[PDB]
Amino acid sequence: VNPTVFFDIAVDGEPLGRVSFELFADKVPKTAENFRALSTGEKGFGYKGSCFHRIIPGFMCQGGDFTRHNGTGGKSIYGEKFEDENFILKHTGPGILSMANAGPNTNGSQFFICTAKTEWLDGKHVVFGKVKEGMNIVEAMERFGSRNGKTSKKITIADCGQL
Numbered sequence: 001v002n003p004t005v006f007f008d009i010a011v012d013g014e015p016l017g018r019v020s021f022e023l024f025a026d027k028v029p030k031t032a033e034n035f036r037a038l039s040t041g042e043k044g045f046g047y048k049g050s051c052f053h054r055i056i057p058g059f060m061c062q063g064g065d066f067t068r069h070n071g072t073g074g075k076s077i078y079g080e081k082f083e084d085e086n087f088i089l090k091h092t093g094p095g096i097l098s099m100a101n102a103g104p105n106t107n108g109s110q111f112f113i114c115t116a117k118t119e120w121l122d123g124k125h126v127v128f129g130k131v132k133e134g135m136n137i138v139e140a141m142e143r144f145g146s147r148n149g150k151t152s153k154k155i156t157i158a159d160c161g162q163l
C-alpha cells in the first residue's frame, strides 16, 4: 500500500538516471502524501524541473525548492508549511528520505536524501521514505557536490511521478 515515486535526474540537461523511493505512508501518511502529490504534479506545482541546490558528499543531497529556486522556497500541498507529523523513523543510513526545514513545524516541499547515517538529525527532521532503486544515481550526483554544498553542474529533476 506504500506508494512509490520516481525522479529522472539530469546533469546540465543530460539524462543521468532514475531514483525511485518508497514512501512510508503507513507511518507518516500526511508527509508521504505531500511528497507523492508534489512528484505527480497533480496540484499544478511540484518537483518537476526543480534542482538539487545543496549536495554535500558523504552527507546528503537536498532539493525541492520549486517556488524561489534559491534554497529558501517551496510549499506543501497543505497551503504553505505543515507540522512535524512524528519522529518515529530515524536517519539510519544511506538512502533515507527526510524533510528539510527551518525549525519545528516548518515542513514545505524541500527534502533531502541521506548518503550516510545522520543521527543528529533524529527528532528534528521527519523521515518519510527511502530510496528503493537508483542509489547508484544518488552516488553519481555526489560527484557534482562540494564541501559547502554548491553544485558544480545543474542537477535537476527532469521528470517525476508515481509508479
Ligand SMILES: CO[C@@H]1CC/C=C/c2cccc(c2)COC(=O)[C@@H]2CCCN(N2)C(=O)[C@H](Cc2cccc(O)c2)NC(=O)[C@H](C(C)C)NC(=O)[C@@H]1C
Pocket: 054, 056, 060, 062, 070, 071, 072, 073, 099, 100, 101, 102, 103, 110, 111, 112, 148, 149
Ligand atoms: C537558505 O536557507 C537558509 C539555510 C542556510 C544554510 C544552511 C546550510 C548551508 C550549508 C551546509 C548546511 C546548511 C548543512 O546542513 C544541511 O545541509 C542540512 C541537511 C538537512 C536538510 N537541511 N540542510 C535543512 O533542512 C536546512 C537545515 C539548516 C538550517 C539553518 C542552518 C543550518 O546549518 C541548517 N534547512 C534549510 O535548508 C532551510 C530550507 C528548508 C527552507 N533554509 C533555512 O533554514 C535558512 C533560511
